[PDB]
Amino acid sequence: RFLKVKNWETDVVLTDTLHLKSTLETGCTEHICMGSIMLPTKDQLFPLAKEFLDQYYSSIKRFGSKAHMDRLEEVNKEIESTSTYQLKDTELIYGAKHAWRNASRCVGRIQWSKLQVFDARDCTTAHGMFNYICNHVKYATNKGNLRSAITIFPQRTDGKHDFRVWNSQLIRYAGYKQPDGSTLGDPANVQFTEICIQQGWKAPRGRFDVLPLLLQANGNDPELFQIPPELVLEVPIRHPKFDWFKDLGLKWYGLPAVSNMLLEIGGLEFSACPFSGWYMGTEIGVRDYCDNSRYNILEEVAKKMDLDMRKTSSLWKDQALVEINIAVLYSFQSDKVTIVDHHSATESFIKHMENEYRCRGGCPADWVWIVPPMSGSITPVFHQEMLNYRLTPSFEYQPDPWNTHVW
Amino acid sequence: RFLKVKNWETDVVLTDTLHLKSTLETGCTEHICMGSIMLPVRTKDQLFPLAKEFLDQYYSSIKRFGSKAHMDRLEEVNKEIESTSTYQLKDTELIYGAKHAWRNASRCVGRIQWSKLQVFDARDCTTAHGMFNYICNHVKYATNKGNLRSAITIFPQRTDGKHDFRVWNSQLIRYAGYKQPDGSTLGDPANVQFTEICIQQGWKAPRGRFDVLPLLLQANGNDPELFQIPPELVLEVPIRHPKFDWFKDLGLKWYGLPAVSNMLLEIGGLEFSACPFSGWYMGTEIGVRDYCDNSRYNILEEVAKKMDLDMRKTSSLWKDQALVEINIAVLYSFQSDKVTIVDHHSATESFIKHMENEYRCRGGCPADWVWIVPPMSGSITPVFHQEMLNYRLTPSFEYQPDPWNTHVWKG
Numbered sequence: 015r016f017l018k019v020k021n022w023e024t025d026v027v028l029t030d031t032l033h034l035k036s037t038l039e040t041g042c043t044e045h046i047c048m049g050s051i052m053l054p055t056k057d058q059l060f061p062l063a064k065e066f067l068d069q070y071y072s073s074i075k076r077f078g079s080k081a082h083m084d085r086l087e088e089v090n091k092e093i094e095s096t097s098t099y100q101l102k103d104t105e106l107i108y109g110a111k112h113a114w115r116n117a118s119r120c121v122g123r124i125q126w127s128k129l130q131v132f133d134a135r136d137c138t139t140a141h142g143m144f145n146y147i148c149n150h151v152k153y154a155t156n157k158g159n160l161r162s163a164i165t166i167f168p169q170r171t172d173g174k175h176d177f178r179v180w181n182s183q184l185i186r187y188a189g190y191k192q193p194d195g196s197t198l199g200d201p202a203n204v205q206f207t208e209i210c211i212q213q214g215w216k217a218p219r220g221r222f223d224v225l226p227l228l229l230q231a232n233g234n235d236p237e238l239f240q241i242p243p244e245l246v247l248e249v250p251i252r253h254p255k256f257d258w259f260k261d262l263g264l265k266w267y268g269l270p271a272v273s274n275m276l277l278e279i280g281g282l283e284f285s286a287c288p289f290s291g292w293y294m295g296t297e298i299g300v301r302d303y304c305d306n307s308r309y310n311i312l313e314e315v316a317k318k319m320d321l322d323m324r325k326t327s328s329l330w331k332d333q334a335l336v337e338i339n340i341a342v343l344y345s346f347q348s349d350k351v352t353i354v355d356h357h358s359a360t361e362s363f364i365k366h367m368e369n370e371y372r373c374r375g376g377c378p379a380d381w382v383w384i385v386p387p388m389s390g391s392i393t394p395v396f397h398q399e400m401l402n403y404r405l406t407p408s409f410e411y412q413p414d415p416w417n418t419h420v421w
Numbered sequence: 422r423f424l425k426v427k428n429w430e431t432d433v434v435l436t437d438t439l440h441l442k443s444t445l446e447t448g449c450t451e452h453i454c455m456g457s458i459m460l461p462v463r464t465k466d467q468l469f470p471l472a473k474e475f476l477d478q479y480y481s482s483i484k485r486f487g488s489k490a491h492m493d494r495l496e497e498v499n500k501e502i503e504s505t506s507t508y509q510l511k512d513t514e515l516i517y518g519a520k521h522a523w524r525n526a527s528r529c530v531g532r533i534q535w536s537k538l539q540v541f542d543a544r545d546c547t548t549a550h551g552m553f554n555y556i557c558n559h560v561k562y563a564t565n566k567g568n569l570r571s572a573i574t575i576f577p578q579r580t581d582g583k584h585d586f587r588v589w590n591s592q593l594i595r596y597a598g599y600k601q602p603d604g605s606t607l608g609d610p611a612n613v614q615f616t617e618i619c620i621q622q623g624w625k626a627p628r629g630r631f632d633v634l635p636l637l638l639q640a641n642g643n644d645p646e647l648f649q650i651p652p653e654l655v656l657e658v659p660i661r662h663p664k665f666d667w668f669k670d671l672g673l674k675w676y677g678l679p680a681v682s683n684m685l686l687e688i689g690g691l692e693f694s695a696c697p698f699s700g701w702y703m704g705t706e707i708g709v710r711d712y713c714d715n716s717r718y719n720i721l722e723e724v725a726k727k728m729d730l731d732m733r734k735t736s737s738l739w740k741d742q743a744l745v746e747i748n749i750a751v752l753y754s755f756q757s758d759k760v761t762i763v764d765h766h767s768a769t770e771s772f773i774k775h776m777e778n779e780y781r782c783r784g785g786c787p788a789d790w791v792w793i794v795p796p797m798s799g800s801i802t803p804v805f806h807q808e809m810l811n812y813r814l815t816p817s818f819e820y821q822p823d824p825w826n827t828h829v830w831k832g
């Protein structure tokens with residue numbers, strides 16, 4: 015029932031009790047582990063509400079008080095009557111911060127409590143959504159001094175009137191398939207780019223074309239909007255030692271802002287809730303640039319370094335990989351856009367584990383996602399056993415809206 | 422019930438039916454994943470079904486399921502169990518069992534090689550001196566002057582758990598570690614406790630940075646005994662760098678033969694507590710973990726100093742830079758001395774091909790992602806994007822407690 019996690023580098027042992035307050039399902043069984051898999055009513059709503067409010071009122075040290083009990087009745091009277099209910103601003107703020115606190119795949123959670131929450135529940139149109147989003151981007155960007163933030167659109171009702179940001183991130187580059195066979199721009203985004211062009215977008219058909227936002231309010235058909243170029247902070251990528259590196263003509267955006275997740279608080283579902291923080295360097299240098307299925311530039315870089323690419327054993331992919339990542343970090347730092355390296359981010363997470371063990375009884379963590387995609391074992395998270403479990407409030411995946419929505 | 426795994430790089434989907442033959446627990450539940458947890462005498466009653474499952478498997482594999490030779494073998498094992506409480510495997514069953522224990526090792530990226538394994542039957546061994554002789558022969562045959570060959574040596578199975586054969590070393594070949602009064606360590610920090618035991622057993626430690634440890638060997642539940650492996654049998658490789666001439670002056674070397682000697686081999690319910698096996702190294706096992714773990718040789722600071730890296734901010738990636746040059750040095754050194762080694766790109770690519778073939782011919786390939794993905798450059802290797810299902814098949818290799826923790830000393 016009590017569970018131990020050990021660090022094999024420092025010999026330090028923590029005891030987990032938070033997992034008993036666990037609530038959703040992992041995908042695993044005692045027969046088979048699924049840790050490496052990417053995706054595994056009035057009667058339904060009240061327990062969920064009760065569960066959340068109980069945790070809310072406990073955290074402000076007001077458990078079992080008159081203010082607690084009255085709110086429980088108030089939400090109950092509202093469910094039995096309206097088939098749903100509304101969160102107070104305080105509960106909304108608390109729910110969002112805890113969805114992040116509980117995100118077992120996020121290495122940046124040391125920051126969980128400094129989340130700026132923007133309440134967009136009064137939104138009714140896609141033009142309104144666009145306005146809210148532009149304000150979020152500008153506030154979060156903050157001329158390079160990035161600040162975490164989330165904007166929360168109206169909760170799901172009958173599921174026929176969902177708000178959705180069709181973009182998977184607020185700021186992403188287009189992807190175009192060509193007769194050549196190869197891909198121009200970002201291959202992850204080819205399909206969404208087809209939908210933009212098919213809804214009317216005039217594509218510049220270049221390598222780094224910032225996608226338009228595709229916004230759906232109240233279950234209606236979505237609409238296109240171009241984020242003002244002056245709000246999209248981008249960084250050209252150069253190297254501190256390699257002058258030729260600029261001639262690759264690489265750039266990336268300063269703001270990572272995930273816009274396709276569903277935020278679940280007290281059984282209420284927020285289908286549109288873009289959130290943003292700041293990049294860990296490997297996210298761009300390792301995955302975005304170096305994934306076979308993404309910009310896939312390794313081949314091109316190692317060539318410029320005049321390395322022996324005859325045999326895998328010269329570790330030429332690995333040499334190029336490190337320099338690509340040196341450059342990203344350097345470029346951001348020199349243009350003064352917040353960014354964190356994987357050594358620094360993992361060291362912060364470990365300290366954050368310790369705090370959550372001592373202050374909360376544990377910290378849900380998904381080792382497969384916490385360990386950075388390069389140099390894993392020279393970061394302190396590699397040697398750290400972690401327990402993975404699902405708590406609410408939470409962020410969840412949801413189907414791409416284009417498969418679901420009807421025109 | 423069919424289960425699908427996807428490769429997120431190549432879009433290939435595969436279908437596992439093999440997990441249906443799974444026995445032992447994972448540690449995981451519907452409510453908790455234990456995926457990153459490191460370490461998560463039998464009755465007649467329980468022994469015969471285990472014998473039965475195994476013999477059913479063996480006889481299917483040779484296409485003789487339900488034959489007279491199958492039925493008679495079950496009858497014979499049946500009788501042997503009821504009358505003696507245990508049973509003996511035929512040579513064929515032992516060979517097949519040890520290959521399948523390897524085939525089933527879900528944390529092993531080297532499994533493409535599973536069917537080429539030399540098996541040495543040391544079930545006639547009775548004494549520690551007998552064990553030393555078996556182990557020297559294994560070391561010699563496996564080393565093959567650099568052209569390494571996989572081998573396993575199998576000592577007598579457990580009886581009452583009071584007469585166990587054990588090799589106290591965790592690997593047949595490993596370097597001593599010595600804790601100094603000032604708190605620092607000389608040699609390999611991972612082996613300090615074991616070095617201490619050896620010294621107390623009467624080993625005269627030379628006290629250098631790369632002292633090959635002696636074998637501590639327990640036969641038939643007796644107190645263990647010390648033996649020096651003949652040095653001419655210990656193939657070692659001095660570490661140098663193809664471009665960095667100062668690299669040799671770090672004084673590093675490593676041994677060619679990885680040979681795990683602390684696992685328990687389970688076949689059809691029987692437990693072989695001493696069963697050392699060996700293969701050849703993947704370069705990252707020496708260059709990332711052995712040299713560059715903080716709790717091991719920890720030469721990263723020393724190497725980056727000599728490269729003249731900017732070591733004032735982690736964000737220069739000085740650590741990542743040095744780690745790569747060290748791993749380059751390890752691969753270059755083994756290849757130049759003609760000692761078999763595999764780099765992590767080649768190993769993981771091989772493993773991916775193995776895995777696909779296993780799904781097609783066997784209906785699955787249990788695989789532990791936390792362990793299969795290499796400890797450097799994970800995502801530029803094809804295992805990183807590969808979903809994997811982890812489950813436990815027998816025959817299998819299991820952890821067991823260290824014998825100094827359990828052993829009843831006689832004197």
Ligand code: HEM
Pocket residue numbers: 114117119120121122123125129162163164289290291292293294297301354359383409
């Ligand atoms: C402040 C700086 C932040 C850093 C450095 C960071 C870091 C990361 C990284 C590296 C990942 C995995 C990346 C990958 O896809 O390879 C991740 C996942 C995730 N993060 Fe963060 N994060 C930050 C802020 C935030 C914020 C503000 C939120 C929400 C409020 C958040 C919620 C999540 C969630 C839900 C996941 C996993 C989603 C999934 O299941 O795939 N993070 N984080």
Ligand code: HEM
Pocket residue numbers: 523526528529530531532534538571572573698699700701702703706763768792818
């Ligand atoms: C032939 C060359 C081989 C290579 C390159 C290889 C590679 C590896 C590597 C890199 C690991 C992970 C170890 C670590 O990083 O800590 C491993 C684990 C393992 N290998 Fe192999 N292996 C080989 C042969 C063998 C053989 C011959 C056997 C047994 C007959 C074996 C059985 C195992 C087992 C049981 C584990 C998991 C240990 C555990 O559960 O902790 N492998 N292998």
Ligand SMILES: Cc1cc(N)nc(CCc2cccc(CCc3cc(C)nc(N)c3)c2)c1
Pocket residue numbers: 122270271272274275289290291292293294297411412414
């Ligand atoms: C806020 C933030 C900070 C940061 N440093 N990186 C990121 C990008 C990583 C990230 C985080 C959460 C969520 C995602 C994508 C979720 C996602 C992923 C896939 C493959 N399919 C879906 N339907 C949904 C990606 C975001």
Ligand SMILES: Cc1cc(N)nc(CCc2cccc(CCc3cc(C)nc(N)c3)c2)c1
Pocket residue numbers: 531679680681683684698699700701702703706819820821822
């Ligand atoms: C044959 C072989 C080939 C290779 N390339 N690498 C290795 C080393 C990795 C390896 C493999 C199996 C087993 C171990 C040790 C596991 C181990 C760990 C603990 C704590 N207790 C135990 N009883 C056992 C280590 C071995």
Ligand SMILES: C[C@H](O)[C@H](O)[C@H]1CNc2nc(N)[nH]c(=O)c2N1
Pocket residue numbers: 022396397398399400456457458459791792793
């Ligand atoms: C805590 C964590 O599970 C532990 O450090 C593991 C992770 N993955 C590993 N993977 C390999 N190949 N070898 C190891 O020793 C470890 N250590």
Ligand SMILES: C[C@H](O)[C@H](O)[C@H]1CNc2nc(N)[nH]c(=O)c2N1
Pocket residue numbers: 049050051052382383384429805806807808809
């Ligand atoms: C198959 C495997 O689950 C998949 O490659 C995962 C592994 N770890 C990851 N880790 C991070 N941080 N991001 C990812 O997209 C993935 N992909």
Ligand SMILES: [Zn+2]
Pocket residue numbers: 042043046047048049449453454455456
């Ligand atoms: Zn699991």
